[PDB]
Specification:
Distance between the termini of chain C: 87 Å
Radius of gyration of chain C: 28 Å
Structural class of chain A: mainly alpha
Number of strands of chain C: 0
Subcellular location (chain A): Nucleus
Family (chain A): Belongs to the Mediator complex subunit 7 family.
Number of helices of chain C: 2
Shape of chain A: rod-shaped
Largest sheet of chain A: none
Order of helices and strands of chain A: H
Structural class of chain C: mainly alpha
Chains: A mainly alpha (46), B mainly alpha (46), C mainly alpha (70)
Helix content of chain A: over 70%
Strand content of chain A: under 5%
Distance between the termini of chain A: 68 Å
Shape of chain C: elongated
Protein name (chain A): Mediator of RNA polymerase II transcription subunit 7
Coiled coil (chain C): 15-55
Largest sheet of chain C: none
Radius of gyration of chain A: 20 Å
Number of strands of chain A: 0
Strand content of chain C: under 5%
Oligomer: part of a larger assembly
Organism (chain A): Saccharomyces cerevisiae (strain ATCC 204508 / S288c) (Baker's yeast)
Largest interface: A-C, 12 and 15 residues
Chain lengths: 46, 46, 70
């Protein structure tokens, strides 16, 4: 059952790090989208 | 007439190169804004 | 019946532990590559971040020397 405990800890930290990673690219992508929208807005005001 | 002149400061101010200087400052700030916005557009597209 | 439905629901209840051994080993492998990929991801994110910082500084300097040009 020690191997089973190793497995369960394995998937819990694996899914936690996947959640952290995915929120990282989500937030950086939303920042990049905001930057592109601002660039378009300032280009329209030129 | 003199009374009406007296109470209003704006008319007495109304009553010539400064306008040209203001136009020059407006156009130079406009062109520097255009240049910096062009630089931002060029840089952000990567 | 809860005893029966819990005893048969144990992953690995009907799976031999040695293929768990290979799956765990390859899990740590693909883990090694996934933090590696996160290393390149974070380094290029920081690269674009200080590109953004450099353009911020240049734009701020332009504003400052333009509004003090008159």
């Amino acid at each position: 059952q020690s191997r089973e405990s190793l497995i369960m800890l394995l998937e819990e930290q694996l899914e936690y790090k996947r959640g952290e990673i995915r929120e990282i690219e989500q937030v950086c992508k939303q920042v990049h989208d905001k930057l592109t929208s601002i660039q378009d807005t300032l280009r329209t005001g030129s | 007439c003199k009374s009406l002149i007296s109470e209003n400061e704006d008319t007495k101010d109304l009553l010539p190169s400064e306008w040209q200087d203001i136009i020059h400052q407006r156009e130079q700030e406009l062109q520097i804004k255009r240049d910096v916005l062009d630089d931002l557009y060029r840089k952000l597209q990567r | 019946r809860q005893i029966n439905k819990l005893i048969d629901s144990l992953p690995g209840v009907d799976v031999s532990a040695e293929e768990q051994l290979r799956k765990i080993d390859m899990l740590q492998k693909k883990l090694v590559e996934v933090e590696d990929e996160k290393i390149e991801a974070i380094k290029k994110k920081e690269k674009l971040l200080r590109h953004v910082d450099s353009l911020i500084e240049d734009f701020v300097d332009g504003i400052a020397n333009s509004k003090k040009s008159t």
